């Protein structure tokens, strides 16, 4: 595989193999007290500043140049420039990747197959405006001359999370707006317990699905209907409670959606980098396009960092980087994002889909198999509610888990005189102070003595309290959550996953991993129904099935 | 440590080295006509059946003897039994482990320093179905003389995640129950947006702590009490509108609330398992008494499956070896939890704590360092979610990542004459199918040709399109997630993780992990106040707090 041969991927290991002993955070710190200034970047976007702060990684100077190497190496400046340019980097499926275009605040043009996307892209953005101000301001109507007072998202994956993930963040700036629900499952509860709670008079659905043949969104679309037209009856009604995020004007038409409320996207919009396009309508509604066009222009900010700033400097390569240490050389399997911000509850969720389902590949570039590995599991909860959870393994368990620890310096809601605030501030501090400090023997042995423990219950007691540490961890803190700075973030860690496909020599941005449960999904689906048993595939699937049918009717 | 020198433990270990290369799942499969029969547990609760099939797992069976004669060896029974009687297993902290107390139906005495524990536990018991019965009728009033509407249970990690999971999951049971809303985090914006949606004279607040000390609970519960005295301004008023549930009688007097008003919960109860107590208040409030009832029986059921049953057909021992398997022989960092139920949607989350944090350990009962893996990473999202996130990574990624697939029979929501469910039992069996059988290349490009592609689009797509397969997983099939049955089923996960304390020879019931964090954020909290430098801490410590002093100020 192309990693394994690189020189300086090479260099790496061996820098690994004979050093990795001389990395312990607190000699680290110890010798260095300029430490933080050397191994931290501080961005002002002019509208809040960013500091990541990377200092409580495994790292030295010649680490951090060795790394740089590899990028260099591995053509990341390179690759870089073909996704700006429009060029067809998604190789399998042979589509350029322009999850960049859709916020190109500067509307330079983007050129794919000699034509600029730009007035295709403004057209659309143009579309969502006039709708949201039309929704919002009361002038959209329903079928009993009512406003819009619930807006559901229908929709699987990429046509999904983002747009949860952002209104969840966003939530202080949807006043006026309507509120929001998502229903993607397809299991029957999503949308049963959501309709339970909706008036149709004043529902708008939004069906949100590329080719609107997607089994999952289009059943669920269609169990919506069918309830909407119970209370309704007329199907011309149908126009005015339901909109298509989708390029497949025959099927819209089809559904009793009115064409001209289709917001189209492009096949160069992957459906996880998907936010950005027609697919954050709900967005939009929910917090007004100014705030959305704020969101836009925060990720363009970030896609001019990436582009403009030094590798040794770049904060998506840099992040990157550090994870391709830690994966490739050390072996960790997982990476922890923990933002300390309950808005945030679903950003690592998010990021499960971002990174997961492009990185987790393994057929690089040239049809070759890789021989090392590839993307990280990535998961986490938000702090303080993670710390009681599962911090207890991250710090005396047996996994090294490099954690992405992020915060608000300031908060949308500072009560109590910011009192909860700084409690917050004080938890994300001490957490990563303590992985990386650990408590030794002697440490504890002193608590111990001075809680007044005798001898045989303090030697008994006194292993268990013992932190090894050397655990390390990234800090990213910004100034305050809004949606300019969401969108920074949200485009900084989409670079970072480029940097690491790149490095891997991997497609960040194709899937065909989903493909095989869906076909055999639509083999099962005709045998579930009536009471014969199935004998057709292996025996599991078959006693499975088998079990279905028989618990069916026990009462 | 006490698992690398067991006898059976090495004999796993040299099997694995000299067979791992035959464990194939087509080709045990295909050898085995039987398997599934061999490699299944089929329960029958009386109230429901499971089947805990782990036929899709690398093991024949010669792995399983092993396995099970390993659990012998490592003394699972006895220490089973220990727990079960009373005995201080807890031995960090010289405590007892009794959540299988909570929910003894039975009544069988179980004593703890001479006396039984039962009447205590039917004490509270008898208090939460009194407070229950009289919230959820009408009769008891706030301070207006209006019926209660909401519920705000106030707590963190043990106190918070059994339930919220518990009411996420049992949703379709609260039919004239109060809305239930769970405030956790310190983050001023979680009880602030929820502070923003309630009426003070309909809202009842529920303080859940074990020692009634963790910070982030009482802040929370002062900030609800001084909101609520703002309306209503009678000191008096707050026994109307606050209760405890705690282990520490004085705290909560100190707090200001009715010592009528608290319910009582003991040492032996850890927070992450803790649900089955007066911690399960908000629970009973939501859903009722009676489903509480049964919720504590379906565990109370599997309690005594786990007591009663043979190893080698008892689930809860079955899915902690194939673990132990999967971690100290394969090197799987992480278990994946599946649950294809979108009402079980923080099943996952709630086993983070419940695994991670009983298991996440390092030192041995003799104070010896573990020279072994010990708990995994646990994660995963609700089915089909999870499938259009994170399943390209599972299928064709560089990682070996056992999954747990769950799914009720059937659906509380039996919508479009059961369709969506067909499409979800169909995705369910579909998804561990593929991750077994996987796609070889001659399969792929026989695809690729029907489908018309040129010989060099053929040449270029075919070993993308590839699936090595062999990826194991379980599948625990239910007839339907009443109360009884999610009991039932989280019991079995609580035995689990209990059985692999004992292999791996580490107390699954203490938490001195947490200790260091809150110490450290201690001594940060006066030092983020005012303006000055701070210099007392490591550099980056010390640069991360000045950044925050500066853009304190900063007007964005």
């Not at 149709?200 to 080719?211: D, G, H, Q």
């Not at 001019?304 to 994966?327: C, D, S």
């Not at 997982?334 to 990174?355: E, K, N, S, V």
């Not at 570039?365 to 991250?394: C, M």
Request: aromatic share 10%.
């Amino acid at each position: 595989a192309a990693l394994t041969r690189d020189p300086q991927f090479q260099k790496l290991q061996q820098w690994y193999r004979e050093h990795r002993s001389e990395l312990n955070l607190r000699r680290l710190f110890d010798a260095n007290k300029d430490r933080f200034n050397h191994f931290s970047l501080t961005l002002n976007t002019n509208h809040g500043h960013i500091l990541v702060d990377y200092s409580k990684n495994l790292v030295t100077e010649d680490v951090m140049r060795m790394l740089v190497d590899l990028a260099k190496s591995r053509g990341v400046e390179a690759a870089r420039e073909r996704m700006f340019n429009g060029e067809k980097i998604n190789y399998t499926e042979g589509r350029a990747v322009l999850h960049v275009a859709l916020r190109n605040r500067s509307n330079t043009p983007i050129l794919v197959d000699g034509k600029d996307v730009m007035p295709e892209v403004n057209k659309v953005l143009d579309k969502m405006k006039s709708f949201c101000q039309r929704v919002r301001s009361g002038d959209w109507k329903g079928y009993t001359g009512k406003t819009i007072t619930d807006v559901i998202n229908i929709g699987i994956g990429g046509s999904d999370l983002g747009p949860l993930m952002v209104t969840e963040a966003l939530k202080p700036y949807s006043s006026g707006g309507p509120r929001v629900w998502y229903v993607s499952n397809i299991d029957g509860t999503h949308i049963a317990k959501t309709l339970a709670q909706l008036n149709p008079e004043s529902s708008l659905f939004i069906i949100a699905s590329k080719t609107f043949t997607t089994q999952e969104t289009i059943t669920n679309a269609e169990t919506a209907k069918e309830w909407f037209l119970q209370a309704a009856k007329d199907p011309s009604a149908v126009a005015k409670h339901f909109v298509a995020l989708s390029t497949n004007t025959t099927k819209v038409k089809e559904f009793g959606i009115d064409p001209q409320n289709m917001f189209e996207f492009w096949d160069w919009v992957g459906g996880r980098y998907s936010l950005w396009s027609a697919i954050g309508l709900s967005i939009a509604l929910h917090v007004g396009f100014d705030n959305f066009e704020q969101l836009l222009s925060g990720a363009h900010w970030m896609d001019q960092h990436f582009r403009t700033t030094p590798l040794e400097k770049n904060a998506p390569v840099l992040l990157a980087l550090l994870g391709i240490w830690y994966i490739n050389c050390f072996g960790c399997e997982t990476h922890a994002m923990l933002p300390y911000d309950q808005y945030l509850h679903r950003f690592a969720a998010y990021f499960q889909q971002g990174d997961m389902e492009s990185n987790g590949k393994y057929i690089t570039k040239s049809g070759t198999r890789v021989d090392h590995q590839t993307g990280p599991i990535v998961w986490g909860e938000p702090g303080t509610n993670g710390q009681h959870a599962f911090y207890q393994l991250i710090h005396q368990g047996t996994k090294m888990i490099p954690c992405d620890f992020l915060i608000p310096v300031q908060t949308q809601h500072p009560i109590r005189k910011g009192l909860h605030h700084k409690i917050l501030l004080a938890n994300f501090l001490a957490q990563t102070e303590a992985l990386m400090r650990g408590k030794s023997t002697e440490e504890a042995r002193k608590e111990l003595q001075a809680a007044g423990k005798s001898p045989e219950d303090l030697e008994r007691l006194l292993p268990h309290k013992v932190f090894e540490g050397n655990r390390p961890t990234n800090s990213i803190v910004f100034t305050k959550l809004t949606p300019f700075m969401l969108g920074a973030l949200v485009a900084m860690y989409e670079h970072k996953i480029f940097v690491q496909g790149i490095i891997w020599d991997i497609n960040s941005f194709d899937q065909w991993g989903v493909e095989l449960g869906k076909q055999l999904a639509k083999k099962i689906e005709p045998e579930l129904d009536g009471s014969a048993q199935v004998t057709s595939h292996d025996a599991s699937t078959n006693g499975l099935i088998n079990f279905i049918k028989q618990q069916r009717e026990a009462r």
